[PDB]
Amino acid sequence: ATLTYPFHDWSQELSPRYAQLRASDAPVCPVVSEGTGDHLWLATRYAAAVELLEDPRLSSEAAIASGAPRQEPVELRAPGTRADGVAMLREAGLRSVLADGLGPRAVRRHQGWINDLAETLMSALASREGTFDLAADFVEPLSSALVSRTLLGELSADERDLLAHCADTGLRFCGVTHEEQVHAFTQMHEFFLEHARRLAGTPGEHLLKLIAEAPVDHGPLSDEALAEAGSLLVVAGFPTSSGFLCGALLTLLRHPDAVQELHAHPERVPSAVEELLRYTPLSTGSVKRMATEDLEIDGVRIKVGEVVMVSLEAVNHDPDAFEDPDVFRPGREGPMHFGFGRGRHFCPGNRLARCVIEATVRAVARRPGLRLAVAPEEISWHEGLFFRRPRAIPATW
């Protein structure tokens, strides 16, 4: 009868449904959730997303709450915990501590090691003969170091592997049983419940130590409170950063001509980062908000309690806002991309993300000739992940 969501486009080829809803006159089109039966609005167009994500009558906190109509098959929350995300740290008056942790002065703390590590990892692959896996031998150490040094603390390899596996298990639309999904969030929470304070006390300036050592006016940040901060940091930072870095690499390796230009012209690198954030698809789902009062958008009513989704992928590929939208064009001068969102809930990790993405682009650009060792079609993808990620990326020089 009507389209069901999500659209099962687990590779970098976006579903032709996004294009189809975008070409519609409507600012929103009705879809039905596969895993809940919930009816939902989907927006695909730059013009519509611009209005929908700046409207304070559309609430992110509501659409996170239990009972909200939703796209995901299970609550993204350990049963019995709060998991309303960053609002909990906001509530405890931690606005200045997230500023110190993710703001410009943290990028100055960490940007030096991040750039040297990216160069080192690419230098090591340059030593190999034949074929190597960029996902395991570049993306995984780089995103792990990002997560551990700027967010979590020193992980052991097995702890890191545990946190990755839980993220990959919980953050899915399909492919695992719902009981495993629920247990992945439980497994993360009990880990942080038992190790958050030790992780916060290890050396470094990582965000979890800043949270733990912060003085809450009239408060001690509880261990239950610390654990939820750690779950949020893994969920927000780890699968997003690894998913995107993998996709960005496939984008770069498929455009050798663009990469040569960045090699000749290093001042162009920061602009190619932004184009990567617009061109490279990440989420198989949508950002979402709940109408807390009736409203109207270009002739469509949105009643109280209805849920509006905006697919960042569809909007970043909107020909109305981006000429030749399927072309990777680092010189492009258009509107701001929707890769970190827009409005009040703009990604607060956006400056750390940009810094790792830029290190990676530079590391590719210093060593030209790096190319896919298999056709893009023979690449194998994890299916059902919220955040697209290839199984491996075979590459050679």
Ligand X SMILES: O=C1N[C@@H](Cc2c[nH]c3ccccc23)C(=O)N2CCC[C@@H]12
282 forms part of the interface with ligand X (CB under 6 A): yes
What is the closest distance, in whole angstroms, from the C-beta atom of residue 378 to ligand X in the complex?
26
Q: Which of residues 31 and 277 has its CB atom nearest to ligand HEM in the complex?
A: 277
Q: Which of residues 33-52 bind ligand X (CB under 6 A)?
A: none
Stretch that binds ligand HEM, among 35-43, 236-244, 261-269, 324-332 (CB under 6 A): 236-244
Partner in contact with 175, chosen from ligand HEM, ligand X, none, beta carbon below 5 to 8 Å by kind: none
* Residue 303 backbone dihedrals phi, psi, to 5 degrees: -80, 165
Omega prior to 104 cis, within 30 of 0:
no
Partner in contact with 75, chosen from ligand HEM, ligand X, none, beta carbon below 5 to 8 Å by kind: none
Coil, helix or strand at residue 4: strand
Coil, helix or strand at residue 371: strand
Stretch that binds ligand HEM, among 31-39, 153-161, 249-257, 345-353 (CB under 6 A): 345-353
Contact at 8 Å (CB) between 336 and 278?
no
Helices (H) and strands (E) in the chain, counts: 16, 11
Size of the site for ligand X (CB under 6 A): 18
Cα dihedral 147, 184, 172, 99 sign: negative
Partner in contact with 364, chosen from ligand X, ligand HEM, none, beta carbon below 5 to 8 Å by kind: none
Among 171, 297, 352, 355, binds ligand X (CB under 6 A): 171
Which residues lie below 8 Å from residue 356, measured CB to CB, with a gap of 6+?
A: 114, 118, 142, 143, 146, 241, 245
395 forms part of the interface with ligand X (CB under 6 A): no
What is the closest distance, in whole angstroms, from the C-beta atom of residue 19 to ligand HEM in the complex?
20
In the bound complex, which residue of the shown chain has the CB atom lying closest to ligand HEM?
Answer: 349
241 forms part of the interface with ligand HEM (CB under 6 A): yes
Partner in contact with 244, chosen from ligand HEM, ligand X, none, beta carbon below 5 to 8 Å by kind: ligand HEM
Q: Which of residues 250-279 bind ligand HEM (CB under 6 A)?
A: 277
Tokens standing for residue 319: 């020909």
**What does the H/E/C string look like for 81-108?**
CCCCCCHHHHHCCCHHHHHHHHCHHHHH
Closest CA to 114 of 144, 136, 137, 134: 144
End-to-end CA distance of the chain: 49
Closest CA to 172 of 72, 272, 247: 72
237 forms part of the interface with ligand HEM (CB under 6 A): yes
60 forms part of the interface with ligand HEM (CB under 6 A): yes
Stretch that binds ligand HEM, among 29-37, 111-119, 347-355, 370-378 (CB under 6 A): 347-355
Among 6, 69, 85, 390, binds ligand HEM (CB under 6 A): 85
What is the closest distance, in whole angstroms, from the C-beta atom of residue 59 to ligand HEM in the complex?
11
Side chain identity at 28, as an amino acid letter? Answer: V
Distances (CA, A) of 48 to 71, 207, 247: 20, 35, 26
150 forms part of the interface with ligand X (CB under 6 A): no
365 forms part of the interface with ligand X (CB under 6 A): no
Partner in contact with 235, chosen from ligand X, ligand HEM, none, beta carbon below 5 to 8 Å by kind: ligand X
Closest CA to 234 of 289, 187, 175, 177: 187
Side chain identity at 4, as an amino acid letter? Answer: T
Residues within the interface to ligand X (CB under 6 A): 64, 71-72, 76, 85-86, 171, 232, 235-236, 240, 282-283, 285, 287-288, 312, 386
Residues within the interface to ligand HEM (CB under 6 A): 60, 85-86, 146, 236-237, 240-241, 244, 277, 282, 287, 312, 339-341, 345, 347-349, 352-353
